[PDB]
Every structure is written in C-alpha cells, then in structure tokens.
Amino acid sequence: GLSDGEWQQVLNVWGKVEADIAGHGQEVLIRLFTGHPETLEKFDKFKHLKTEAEMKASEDLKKHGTVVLTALGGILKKKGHHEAELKPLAQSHATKHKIPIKYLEFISDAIIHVLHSKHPGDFGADAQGAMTKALELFRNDIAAKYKELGFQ
Numbered sequence: 351g352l353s354d355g356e357w358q359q360v361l362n363v364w365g366k367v368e369a370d371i372a373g374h375g376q377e378v379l380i381r382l383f384t385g386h387p388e389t390l391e392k393f394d395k396f397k398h399l400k401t402e403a404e405m406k407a408s409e410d411l412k413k414h415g416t417v418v419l420t421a422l423g424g425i426l427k428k429k430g431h432h433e434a435e436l437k438p439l440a441q442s443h444a445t446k447h448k449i450p451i452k453y454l455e456f457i458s459d460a461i462i463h464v465l466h467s468k469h470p471g472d473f474g475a476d477a478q479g480a481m482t483k484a485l486e487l488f489r490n491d492i493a494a495k496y497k498e499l500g501f502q
C-alpha cells in the first residue's frame with residue numbers, strides 16, 4: 351500500500367528504466383541467473399547459457415528482458431490497480447512456468463541491485479524505499495493468486 355508520494359518516486363525511478371529498457375532488462379536477468387542459477391533452469395530457452403558472457407551476448411535474453419520489464423512497467427503505472435494485468439501473469443507463472451514465489455523475491459532484489467549499479471548515487475534512500483514497497487505489493491498480490499491455486 352503506497353502513498354501518492356511513494357508512487358511518484360516509483361514512476362520517477364521507472365523513467366530511468368524506460369530510457370534504456372533493454373539494457374536494464376538484460377542486467378536484471380543476468381543478476382538473477384548468476385545470483386540464483388537454479389532460476390536459469392526454469393527457462394528452456396536460456397538453460398543453454400553456461401557463462402555470463404554468453405548471457406551478455408544473447409539478443410534473445412535482452413529481448414525477454416524487454417518483455418519482462420515492459421510488463422512490470424505497465425503494472426507499476428497502474429499504481430496498485432493492476433488486477434487485470436497481474437492475474438494472467440500469476441496464472442501463467444503458477445500453472446505453466448511453475449515459478450515459486452521465492453524466485454519473484456529474487457528478481458525483486460535484483461532490480462534494486464541493478465538500479466544502484468547503473469545509477470550510483472542517483473538512487474536515493476527514499477527512491478529505494480518506494481521501489482521496494484512497490485515490488486513487495488506486486489509479489490504479495492501474485493502470492494495471493496498462488497495460494498488460490500494451491501501452488502508451491
């Protein structure tokens with residue numbers, strides 16, 4: 351549950367991501383995959399990547415990074431009013447992709463990490479607080495749908 355001041359910060363930060371959505375998306379996925387290699391096994395089309403150089407060189411990985419952050423951005427722009435947008439993602443990730451909620455925690459922290467990395471000294475404490483709350487909201491609403499589906 352975010353205040354409008356916090357949403358303002360979220361969307362301000364997101365402006366950074368949108369100036370280079372593919373670059374941000376790429377680095378987020380790389381941080382996830384290298385930080386938590388088990389997550390790589392959920393992707394039949396990336397499981398072949400064994401090194402980070404191969405990851406960095408992968409145009410399809412960058413492409414999926416764009417798809418992921420485009421979807422997240424559409425969701426963030428709803429400022430919490432994202433039931434329509436979130437439900438199919440929850441459903442596809444629970445039932446088709448079988449992504450445990452832990453992995454959504456992983457990618458949440460990865461976004462935080464990447465923002466600091468690409469914007470050192472430009473991602474203030476207030477901005478981190480707001481972004482973290484937004485990602486928690488996202489995760490928590492997915493988690494509710496996971497529970498409905500009995501998905502672990």
Ligand code: HEM
Binds near residue numbers: 389421422443453457
């Ligand atoms: C911010 C969090 C995430 C967002 C916004 C997101 C969004 C999406 C979207 C829009 C798609 C394509 C449409 C669909 O299949 O529903 C997708 C596919 C997929 N996602 Fe997610 N995702 C997120 C997190 C994750 C995580 C953490 C994992 C695994 C650790 C994951 C695994 C997958 C897989 C395996 C596919 C299918 C890829 C393919 O074969 O093309 N997702 N995701």
